[PDB]
């Protein structure tokens, strides 16, 4: 999946 | 000369508000030019009707995947994916519109709107726009998120386009 992490 | 696009957000069908952005095409062309052409619907697919599948309170709002609606794909205007324009602009604070890639040089249609200063992303995510008006609309739709990203309710881009 795509997306930035914290 | 800097494009301005907008999103008309709804919470489970019921219209909620409008959120505009300033696309920095001056510095981040191929990325900015990309987001404008999808916000309008300039090719048949675009962000209209798509939703924010991943919202995390205090972090960001993820959307841009009109195909899968989960995070898997979502096509751009150049066929499927594209390289990282640059990292000149940094996730300075909430409102910052950035690309939500999956490992370097894989930018498609997924983006995220920041709801806090997120510096750790600087250098990994291509920043290219910023909410102009409606940061209070992104705040409301933020409340309908969770911790793993699950949306407490269906958030959608009820309509979208270019005003400048």
């Amino acid at each position: 999946h795509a997306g930035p992490i914290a | 000369v800097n494009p301005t696009v907008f999103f008309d957000i709804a919470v489970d069908g019921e219209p909620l508000g409008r959120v505009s952005f300033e696309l920095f095409a001056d510095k981040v062309p191929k990325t900015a030019e990309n987001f404008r052409a999808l916000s309008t619907g300039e090719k048949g697919f675009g962000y209209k009707g798509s939703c924010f599948h991943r919202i995390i309170p205090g972090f960001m709002c993820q959307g841009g995947d009109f195909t899968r609606h989960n995070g898997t794909g979502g096509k751009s205007i150049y066929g499927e994916k594209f390289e990282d324009e640059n990292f000149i602009l940094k996730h300075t604070g909430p409102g910052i519109l950035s690309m939500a890639n999956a490992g370097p040089n894989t930018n498609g249609s997924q983006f995220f709107i920041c709801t806090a200063k997120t510096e750790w992303l600087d250098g990994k995510h291509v920043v290219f726009g910023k909410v102009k008006e409606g940061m209070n609309i992104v705040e409301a739709m933020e409340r309908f998120g969770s911790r793993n990203g699950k949306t407490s309710k269906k958030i959608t881009i009820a309509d979208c386009g270019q005003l400048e």
Side-chain angles (χ1 to χ4, degrees):
Chain A
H1 310 213
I5 46 196
Chain B
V1 270
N2 252 4
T4 294
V5 291
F6 71 91
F7 284 176
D8 259 303
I9 314 298
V11 176
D12 291 281
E14 179 236 44
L16 163 74
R18 183 179 275 213
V19 177
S20 77
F21 311 95
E22 171 192 349
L23 312 193
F24 309 133
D26 56 322
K27 290 167 292 188
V28 211
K30 189 164 183 173
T31 320
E33 167 200 44
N34 195 85
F35 198 76
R36 183 196 66 59
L38 291 155
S39 297
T40 66
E42 214 159 296
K43 272 98 173 189
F45 19 104
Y47 315 130
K48 182 155 49 283
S50 85
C51 75
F52 294 75
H53 49 254
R54 198 167 161 270
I55 297 176
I56 306 172
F59 177 40
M60 57 85 260
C61 292
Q62 199 172 336
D65 190 40
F66 39 92
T67 55
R68 288 83 211 183
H69 296 116
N70 55 30
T72 318
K75 72 179 178 292
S76 81
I77 62 180
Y78 324 113
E80 273 291 355
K81 305 294 173 189
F82 74 96
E83 65 296 286
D84 293 317
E85 195 122 57
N86 63 99
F87 302 99
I88 299 163
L89 295 175
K90 307 160 60 185
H91 313 63
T92 49
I96 288 302
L97 167 63
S98 203
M99 281 300 280
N101 69 58
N105 295 209
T106 74
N107 302 273
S109 62
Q110 287 184 77
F111 64 81
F112 63 98
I113 307 167
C114 288
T115 74
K117 186 189 179 69
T118 67
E119 58 295 327
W120 58 100
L121 305 179
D122 299 327
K124 300 164 61 64
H125 291 276
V126 177
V127 184
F128 67 106
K130 190 172 182 185
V131 165
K132 287 189 64 174
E133 230 147 323
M135 193 52 214
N136 72 318
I137 304 311
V138 178
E139 264 175 68
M141 75 193 270
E142 166 195 87
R143 292 183 285 84
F144 307 133
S146 68
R147 242 135 75 219
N148 55 50
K150 185 201 174 193
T151 43
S152 180
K153 294 183 176 177
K154 170 61 168 293
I155 305 297
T156 321
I157 302 177
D159 200 13
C160 56
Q162 189 180 195
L163 288 184
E164 193 166 311

